[PDB]
Structure 1
């Protein structure tokens, strides 16, 4: 679990969005596993606007942060799950690091701010949904 709180927006994994997220829907994209809902309170976070390919992510299944080198956002094949059929997920970045399904929502940050959230993984890999191209989150 986990979310990004920036301005009057809450960014979560689309497959983990609540009834309240959908009732306050701003934007969603199944191909990216992202959903953004509106909030009444002002949020705590800064979005990175950069091309970093290194950063640190929070891994809830270890209660620890880990440094990562990650690929640039791209279209990656993701196997069918209970949430989606087998499909290409866009704007996904992969790295070597531990992850389990419940780690989705953990933030990836570089020195400039929030880069994305955990969205996929397995076998010593962790995948992050990029949010750096969503300029409207703070504009």
Structure 2
């Protein structure tokens, strides 16, 4: 679990979104596993606007942060789950690291701010849904 709070927005994994998230829906993209809902309180997270390929992520299944090198956002095959059939997930970045299902929502950060959130795992890889292209989160 986990979310990003920026301005009047809350960014979560689409497969973990709550009834409140869907009742205050701003935008969702099933191909990216993202959903953004509106909030009443102002969020203070800063979104990175960059092309970094190194950062640190929080891994809840180890209660630890790990430094990683990660790929550029791209269309990657992700196996079927109870939330989606087997499909191309877009804007996904992979790194070598530990990720179990409950790790979804952990934040990946670089020196510029929030880069994305854990969205996939397995096979000794961790995949992060990028949010750096969502320029509208800042206004």
Query: Following the alignment from structure 1 to structure 2, what is the Cα–Cα distance between the partners of residues 98 and 137?
Result: 28
SS in 2 for 1:43: strand
Query: Following the alignment from structure 1 to structure 2, what is the Cα–Cα distance between the partners of residues 14 and 25?
Result: 11
Query: Following the alignment from structure 1 to structure 2, what is the Cα–Cα distance between the partners of residues 133 and 44?
Result: 18
SS in 2 for 1:28: strand
SS in 2 for 1:39: strand
- The equivalent residue for 2:128 is 128
Scaled by the length of structure 1, what TM-score is found?
0.99
SS in 2 for 1:26: strand
SS in 2 for 1:92: strand
Query: Following the alignment from structure 2 to structure 1, what is the Cα–Cα distance between the partners of residues 115 and 44?
Result: 15
Q: Which has the higher strand share?
A: 2
Scaled by the length of structure 2, what TM-score is found?
0.99
Deviation >2 Å, runs of 4+: none
- 1:16 shift after superposition: 0.2
1:117 aligns with 2:128: no
Q: Which runs of 5+ in 2 are unaligned?
A: none
The number of aligned residues is 139
- 1:124 shift after superposition: 1.1
SS in 1 for 2:57: strand
- The equivalent residue for 1:43 is 43
- 1:44 shift after superposition: 2.2
SS in 2 for 1:40: strand
Query: Following the alignment from structure 1 to structure 2, what is the Cα–Cα distance between the partners of residues 110 and 10?
Result: 19
- 1:123 shift after superposition: 1.8
SS in 1 for 2:83: coil
